[PDB]
Amino acid sequence: VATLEERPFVIVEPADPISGTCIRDSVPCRSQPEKRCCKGFCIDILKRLAHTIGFSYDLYLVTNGKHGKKIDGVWNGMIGEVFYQRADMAIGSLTINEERSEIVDFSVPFVETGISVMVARSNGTVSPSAFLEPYSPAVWVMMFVMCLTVVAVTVFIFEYLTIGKSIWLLWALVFNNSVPVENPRGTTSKIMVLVWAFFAVIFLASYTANLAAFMIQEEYVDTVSGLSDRKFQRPQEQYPPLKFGTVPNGSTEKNIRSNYPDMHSYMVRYNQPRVEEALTQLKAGKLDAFIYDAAVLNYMARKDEGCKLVTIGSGKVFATTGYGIALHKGSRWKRPIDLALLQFLGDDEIEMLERLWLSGICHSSKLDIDNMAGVFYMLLVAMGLSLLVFAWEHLVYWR
Amino acid sequence: GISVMVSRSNSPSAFLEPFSADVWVMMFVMLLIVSAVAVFVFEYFSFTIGKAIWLLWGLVFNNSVPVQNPKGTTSKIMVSVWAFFAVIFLASYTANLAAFMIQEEYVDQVSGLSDKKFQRPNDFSPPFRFGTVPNGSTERNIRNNYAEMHAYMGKFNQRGVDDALLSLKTGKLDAFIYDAAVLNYMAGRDEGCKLVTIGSGKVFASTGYGIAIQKDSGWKRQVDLAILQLFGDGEMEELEALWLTGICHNEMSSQLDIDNMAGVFYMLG
Amino acid sequence: KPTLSDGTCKEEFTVNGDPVKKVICTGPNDTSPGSPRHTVPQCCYGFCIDLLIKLARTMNFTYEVHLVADGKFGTQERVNNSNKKEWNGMMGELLSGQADMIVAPLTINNERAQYIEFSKPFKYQGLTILVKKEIPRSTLDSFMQPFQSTLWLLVGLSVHVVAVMLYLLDRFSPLTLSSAMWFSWGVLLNSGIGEGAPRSFSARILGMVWAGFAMIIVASYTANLAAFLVLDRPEERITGINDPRLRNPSDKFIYATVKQSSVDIYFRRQVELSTM
Amino acid sequence: ELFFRSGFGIGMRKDSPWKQNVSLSILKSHENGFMEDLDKTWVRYQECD
Amino acid sequence: PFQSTLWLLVGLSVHVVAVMLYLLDRFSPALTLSSAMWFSWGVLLNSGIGEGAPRSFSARILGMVWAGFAMIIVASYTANLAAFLVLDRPEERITGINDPRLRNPSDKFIYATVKQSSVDIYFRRQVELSTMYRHMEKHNYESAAEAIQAVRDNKLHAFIWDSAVLEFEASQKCDLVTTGELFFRSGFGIGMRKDSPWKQNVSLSILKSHENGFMEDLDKTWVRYQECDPATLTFENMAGVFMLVAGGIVAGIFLIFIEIAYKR
Ligand SMILES: *[C@@H]1O[C@H](CO)[C@@H](O[C@@H]2O[C@H](CO)[C@@H](O)[C@H](O)[C@H]2NC(C)=O)[C@H](O)[C@H]1NC(C)=O
Ligand SMILES: *[C@@H]1O[C@H](CO)[C@@H](O)[C@H](O)[C@H]1NC(C)=O
Ligand SMILES: *[C@@H]1O[C@H](CO)[C@@H](O)[C@H](O)[C@H]1NC(C)=O
Ligand SMILES: *[C@@H]1O[C@H](CO)[C@@H](O)[C@H](O)[C@H]1NC(C)=O
Ligand SMILES: N[C@@H](CCC(=O)O)C(=O)O
């Protein structure tokens, strides 16, 4: 059985020097030579089928790199070794494809795999709240209605026993009464205003309590959609050119090149020699997006670093295929293998196995001035709009 | 062990709970000194001690009382500084005082198994009711150290665990005394987990279960090791979850109805 | 859907253009719930049928579509003798030589993969639980809703019985009664109308303590509403498998499932859930 | 939460020789982007808010 | 709240709204510039410091328009202030043994116990959990007494020990607490060699003490001694509430000479 070091499923470590052999809870594996200790997720499954069927295996960590690629005549990696009768099974992180499923055979997949895009976290924004998110523009026109028709009622009962002075007090009471006042001595209106005054007490409840939560940045400011977005489709476009990339000589690169020409040509200058180094190439600002599998990327994104690494579209996968284990294309072990695999999915064996090897950790801000600067915009707008009416009125009176 | 499970019972607390008593009462003396400094200021330029409190204390509670005002220019800057924290103190008071107001009280009815209310049930109010089921160990233990009790609960002796639980919601009897493990399973099973043991699960004679064997029988030695081995392998730790798992967790109503506002009237008292 | 009058399929254009693809279909008429009837043409179309047309023109098919006789997907069981364990429904029909391909939502299962072979899946799917939404209610009538009428009556009469004490205290001081009552009602209402203050030293104390009563009530009253207009504490979610109610039914959360089907097999597959 | 991760499939009899192309052609539909068009046209288009 | 940028802005804002009202009053068809400072600040801090309202028909709309910013600013201040005191509840709170944090090696917090304890026998049997203590074997203190002191200086953060010893420490020191639930139940017990003639009497006396309430006296006297068991903020934060107004008390005494300088 030929495998390879894949971070979540296959972990390779040296043997314990004190004991001189591999530590328990693992399986021996040889290079091609130095003995090594290997364990992970894909290894655990292999114990069950071997127990259920019964055979002898010896891990053969492949010197040749990558997982497999046609080089115009020859195939390397796990697929190539199986293609030349040097290995029956190649267990690990193998993606079922179309070309590969021609010369070899695959078992029933047990894990989803696709294509996803990861971009660093973006700073949230809060639009200037239209009157601080109150009770619709209806209420603002509404308050003008009763207030202007209730001042006249007081004026009517004032003479029976100064309307200009009767609008300063009646209105300003509603907004945290502190301004200078001028109150009449009419008994009938004296009782009336108190009932009106009590309305201002209840009015604050509408403008308090609720307004506390709904003021922080919202809308999630998430933009630039997936492969359907024209931002990718246009290489240069507006702004500095896009900074995506992917690992060459695998499965994702071949799918993108054949299906989407004029794209793989451009990102030939945006490559990453490995996976872990690629992630460091993203946070500071020299790259923005990544194009890789939906199993490696999803694990690390859930693990994250400071809760600031998310996938655009919240996991909108593409080209949904599965994992599996290769065979000899005539190995006649297919029937006892897939039938054995389906039993574990029928039970809860694989449900908790993911918990033991795939589990993340994570998945209220300063208000500043930019988000709620619109409240000041009311002052400047009302300042200039007031000057034209007031100043020009006396010019006509001047003549 | 032995437990007691009773029906759940149906609060001035602190209407001024925010902040604390120590950091608050010290504030009142500061109202004296801040008013005093105005007297020296008001002496220059163009009674005062008495009106100062009205001139000052009427500001912390917003401003509705008719308040006068000293004249001058340099004699009015200080109150402008006072007015700044006048709105600061109120804002802190209205942060979460409503949530702390409706805070419930974990009421209790019985101190414990040896609570003095159990010794003389007829010594106060309508008589208390508490019963067991005889022909067992709990009845045997209760008749060897509390012989004064045994003349009283003989009035009520239910047919079983099932009937007693139903009769508990009525009001005829308000207590139960039985095996601890069985009673915990019932209590953490009913609707809304209303039925709660006294003191949140207190036991009184920690004696375990076991497998009776014939005297001197040689199977005792190796059967003990087998049970001990399973404890180090986490077998019954997860096995109990398949049969002895509860439903509830032993932890709106926008109403006041006096509640703790009596203290506010008690202040006016 | 049933066909037209003459035996043809309609032309339902999609919102984006070309009308959907439709193929004729034969099957039962009245579902045969103990009342079997004849077989009449129908209109079979949709996503799965759209897939079949794609396969037809890529490897030279020639098809004909007929639905299942009963409706059940398929399950192996014994009938009438407890010793005739055999398939039923669509799964039974395929093994009887009446069909050679199955195009429908079929779940790959070990217990039924021995007698047939399965191609690679269309999609990937799981099992979830669907429950009706809980009704949200908001009694925002205001008009002193959160405050019960019990406190309203005494606090309303509290101001009246305390204002009179000012004039009563003015009798022995070392402004009529009506001219003094406006002060107390003014204090509570955060009003702008204010004139006249107590003259005696002790009368100020009565006015002094009344000031504190204004601040506590209205501020705290507009703090109870703070929880009222958000609240939002709904807890009626089963939250997946291993729910205590699911482990032991309480004769209140009644749940149903499709007879035969596959989820019935899954529940029978394990033993820890043999109680419900 | 999901608690049974098994996909759909096309079923037939063991003797059928149609297997080689049916399974191979399904896998090519995934990679060719065809299955997204069917998914977006016959499954997920309506909105409720 | 409002950082710094708005506060030098509002001070600039309150400065600018003061000047133009007088300019909007002098060339009008009857106050002075002295009213500007009092009116501008008077509306803001809910005070009655101001004397009178403008007597005109051009600046009348200004006063109402100005009243809004007095409302909004005081609305936002209280709005966000209560959010931090209530809604913001972040915490890690490592819980349970089933959490993956225990399975994977951790370098920020290490795992240790007392050497040669029953836990050492426990962790060295089950091959499933022979995953982290095969690495944290280097961390095994020689005494449970001094290990608690190690956590005191935040050196250690994970410790496996009997619950009877651990819980009582929380009752004495008022700055320690536990979490999760028990995961290995096994009582204590008097031990002796096989065939000792006391293997039958001494076990019966232990049981007879359980029923007669003796273990109630001993447990209450020693273990359950009881001690100390949050909108109660103190001088850690609000001691700075009332010193600026106290500072302003002594910050205006020199202004009297500045004020009285106009006399001569
Ligand atoms: C599966 O597809 C292959 C690829 O075309 C088919 O192989 C060819 O089939 C045609 C017609 O059956 C023959 O004329 C060719 O000689 C075959 N070989 C090649 C290289 O084209 C195969 O027949 C298909 N399987 C089935 C059952 O139809
Ligand atoms: C218990 O024993 C008594 C006799 O002492 C007998 O009358 C009774 O039926 C037995 N059972 C119960 C439940 O009391
Ligand atoms: C289907 O058959 C026809 C003639 O029988 C011919 O076009 C060819 O053999 C097939 N078409 C294909 C493979 O596209
Ligand atoms: C055990 O207890 C009984 C009780 O009286 C006593 O007679 C006997 O001698 C004891 N045996 C030993 C070995 O102490
Ligand atoms: N491991 C997958 C994806 C390609 C890669 O990991 O490089 C495969 O063998 O196709």
Ligand SMILES: N[C@@H](CCC(=O)O)C(=O)O
């Ligand atoms: N668990 C008890 C029940 C009998 C009793 O109530 O004493 C026993 O078996 O002894």
